[PDB]
Amino acid sequence: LGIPRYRPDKAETEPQVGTAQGLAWTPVGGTLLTIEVAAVPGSGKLSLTGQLGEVMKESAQAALTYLRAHTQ
């Protein structure tokens, strides 16, 4: 077969430092999406890239103010 185009079963993934790994449900059949986040230095502004639905924007706001209930 040739070379392992992945590693084996995913205990070897060795946690990333901020990208979450979401379950997504797609018309090719539901396959993974690891939704990626860049935390940049700045002044407190949001931008959102990547052909996202605005439902994703709203969910970001909801989780975002949930965080703002939990900064303490």
Binding site: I3, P4, R5
Partner: protein, 53 residues
């Protein structure tokens, strides 16, 4: 890499994760072309800068 070689360019920077891709090739490709496999962007930017900043 074949685009690089045919242009006579022989000293390449590539992703570490692409170390696996290398072996369906002859030595024709593999020995004119001198590959510096790296996993980060800090690595390639240390390689590709002539002066210090």
């Amino acid at each position: 890499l074949l685009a690089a070689h045919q242009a006579g360019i022989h000293k390449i920077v590539l992703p570490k994760d692409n170390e696996a891709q290398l072996e369906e090739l002859p030595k024709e490709v593999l020995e004119g072309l001198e590959i510096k496999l790296v996993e980060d962007v800090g690595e390639v930017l240390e390689y590709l800068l002539l002066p210090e900043p």
